[PDB]
Each structure stands twice: as C-alpha cells, then as structure tokens.
Motif scaffolding. Structure first.
Motif, short mmCIF file in Angstrom:
data_model
loop_
_atom_site.label_atom_id
_atom_site.label_comp_id
_atom_site.label_asym_id
_atom_site.label_seq_id
_atom_site.Cartn_x
_atom_site.Cartn_y
_atom_site.Cartn_z
N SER B 35 -62.67 11.14 19.66
CA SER B 35 -63.50 12.18 20.29
C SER B 35 -63.09 13.57 19.79
CB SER B 35 -63.41 12.08 21.81
OG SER B 35 -62.12 12.47 22.25
N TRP B 36 -63.23 13.77 18.48
CA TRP B 36 -62.90 14.98 17.74
C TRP B 36 -64.04 15.32 16.79
CZ3 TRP B 36 -58.01 17.70 17.49
CH2 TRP B 36 -57.05 17.21 18.38
N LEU B 87 -57.01 3.62 30.61
CA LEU B 87 -57.04 5.00 31.09
C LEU B 87 -55.61 5.47 31.32
CD1 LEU B 87 -59.82 4.11 33.55
CD2 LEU B 87 -60.16 5.52 31.50
N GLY B 88 -55.30 6.67 30.84
CA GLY B 88 -53.94 7.16 30.97
C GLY B 88 -53.82 8.61 30.56
N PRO B 104 -55.18 13.67 28.97
CA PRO B 104 -55.76 12.42 29.48
C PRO B 104 -56.51 11.72 28.36
CG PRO B 104 -56.40 14.31 30.85
CD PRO B 104 -55.74 14.86 29.63
N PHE B 105 -56.48 10.39 28.40
CA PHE B 105 -57.19 9.63 27.39
C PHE B 105 -57.81 8.40 28.02
CE2 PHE B 105 -53.07 7.57 27.35
CZ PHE B 105 -53.42 6.23 27.31
N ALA B 106 -58.91 7.97 27.41
CA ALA B 106 -59.54 6.68 27.66
C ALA B 106 -59.63 5.97 26.31
CB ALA B 106 -60.94 6.86 28.26
N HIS B 108 -61.02 2.81 24.40
CA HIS B 108 -61.96 1.70 24.46
C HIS B 108 -61.62 0.69 23.37
CE1 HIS B 108 -66.20 0.04 23.49
NE2 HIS B 108 -65.58 -0.77 24.33
N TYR B 122 -61.00 8.52 23.49
CA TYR B 122 -61.65 9.65 24.14
C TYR B 122 -60.55 10.45 24.83
CZ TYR B 122 -65.74 6.63 23.59
OH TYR B 122 -66.74 5.84 23.09
N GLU B 123 -60.35 11.69 24.41
CA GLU B 123 -59.20 12.44 24.89
C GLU B 123 -59.50 13.93 24.86
OE1 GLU B 123 -56.04 11.40 22.21
OE2 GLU B 123 -56.93 12.48 20.52
N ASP B 124 -58.57 14.72 25.42
CA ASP B 124 -58.70 16.18 25.47
C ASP B 124 -58.35 16.77 24.10
OD1 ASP B 124 -58.76 18.89 25.97
OD2 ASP B 124 -57.60 18.75 27.84
N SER B 125 -59.34 16.76 23.21
CA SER B 125 -59.13 17.29 21.86
C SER B 125 -58.76 18.77 21.88
CB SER B 125 -60.38 17.08 21.01
OG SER B 125 -61.54 17.37 21.75
N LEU B 126 -59.35 19.54 22.80
CA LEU B 126 -59.04 20.97 22.86
C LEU B 126 -57.57 21.21 23.18
CD1 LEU B 126 -60.02 23.88 22.70
CD2 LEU B 126 -60.69 23.71 25.13
N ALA B 127 -57.02 20.47 24.15
CA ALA B 127 -55.62 20.67 24.53
C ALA B 127 -54.67 20.30 23.39
CB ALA B 127 -55.29 19.84 25.77
#
Lengths: 137, 133
Positions: B35-36, B87-88, B104-106, B108, B122-127
C-alpha cells in the motif's frame, strides 16, 4: 440475528451511497475507530484524519471525507470480503479525486470491521496514507 | 495442512527472523502488493514477484531497522477459506535516521497447497516514509 457478512454488505452499500447520517446509523454508540495515519493535523490538508470513538464522530468523518472529494470521480472498488466470526476485512482500492487539488489517486485499503448485535463496533482502516496525503498536499 | 496452520507457521518463522526459512513458505511465484505509491528512501519498498524476492524483502526489513528498539505485535489472525489477514502493528526505529515510528498493518495472505501465493501489505506508508525521509 443477522450474519456478519450481511451487516458488512449493508455498510458497504451505505458508504458507497455517501450519506453520513445513514452510514452512522449502522454503528454502535461507542466505536473503536482507527486509521493507519500518524497523529497530528498534517498541515490541515486531510481534516477527516482525526481520532474518533462515537457514532456521532463516524457521521462527522463521512461528512468531511465527502466534502473533500469530487463525488462523481470517487469510489471504492471492493476486491474481496473475508469473514471470520464477528470480524470481517474488506479488501479494495480507493479510486478518488481530491477536491482542493483536482488530483486523482489510487489507494489500496483493508478495512477491518467487527459487528455485535447487528451494529459495527470496530472500524480500523489500513490504507496507503502516503498516496492520499500526496493527493491533497 | 490448513490455511491457518500455514499462516501460524509463517508467523513463527517471521519471529525467528531467518529470511531464507521465511521464503521457504512462499510459492516460486508470488502475488506481491504494498500500500505504497508506484514511485529508495525506504529500502524495501519495491515490487517483488518471486520467492527469492521475498527472502530479500525480509533480509532488508531486518537490516534497516534498529533491532533493539523495534517490535511487532499481532492482534488478530482472520482466516476465510484459502485467504487470511494478519492484523498488527510495528513499533520500529529507522536504521539510517534513528527516528521511531509506529505502523499498523494488515497482511493479506493466500495459501495454496501449503505455500503462500499472495502477500499484500496494507500499512501506514506515510508514517514509515516520514521516519526514513
């Protein structure tokens, strides 16, 4: 009792239709609401990115996110819906156009939901925050 | 073995940390997605499509974080047929810059014949990007 899958399908229908009051009707009064974004105000460019915990807050989120996008060029494509007990994860991609800049973006997302008594109690979004941020910056 | 058994073994091997043994669990060809944006500030952010590429991904994520200040938590493992979502959250410090972040990430996963054929993060790419930029 209504199945988790049916409750999730109804939520996805209401989110796509866009009306914030009708979406929030599907949530419990108290909601665990999380977004895969850093804390802070992000220089004001993504005002819906804030901490929420209530049905009224959920309604505010969907109002704000609508106001910041071009409705006719924005949608979420759903690829799959996984269901395991009271939990579900919706896998898809945001295909939206940012209102203030006019820039279209694509952002993969996974939306983790929990349902109890037919209401959504947990709504945790894992999405490409970098791509969304860049579209509004 | 079941999808969940395969996923639980992958979590065991990720926690063990050997990139080669992690990749053993993947098919020769893998559907890999992150997710980037499709645009190397964050060294491991690139496309992959093979088992060998998976091994390198896990080698890079170990190398480029400050290990004694990094930790991963798994909150839930959801399984539906051949698919699963883990999820984690990662609480890591960037190796090059020393800056800590939380993401945080999901994750799949799809399992076919006991091998992971799909790995979509799927994760917080911005952070993460901010910590390395």
């Amino acid at each position: 009792m209504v199945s988790t899958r049916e409750t999730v399908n109804e939520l996805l229908r209401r989110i796509a239709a866009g009306d914030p009051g009708r979406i929030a009707e599907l949530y419990a009064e108290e909601v665990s609401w999380k977004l895969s974004w850093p804390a802070g105000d992000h220089m004001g460019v993504v005002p819906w990115i804030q901490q929420r915990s209530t049905r009224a807050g959920v309604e505010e989120h969907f109002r704000l996110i609508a106001d910041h996008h071009v409705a006719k060029q924005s949608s979420a494509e759903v690829f799959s819906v996984l269901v395991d007990g009271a939990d579900a994860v919706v896998l898809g991609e945001l295909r939206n156009t940012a209102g203030p800049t006019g820039r279209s973006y694509e952002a993969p997302f996974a939306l983790h939901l929990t349902v109890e008594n037919g209401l959504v109690t947990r709504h945790h979004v894992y999405e490409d925050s970098l791509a969304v941020f860049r579209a509004f910056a």
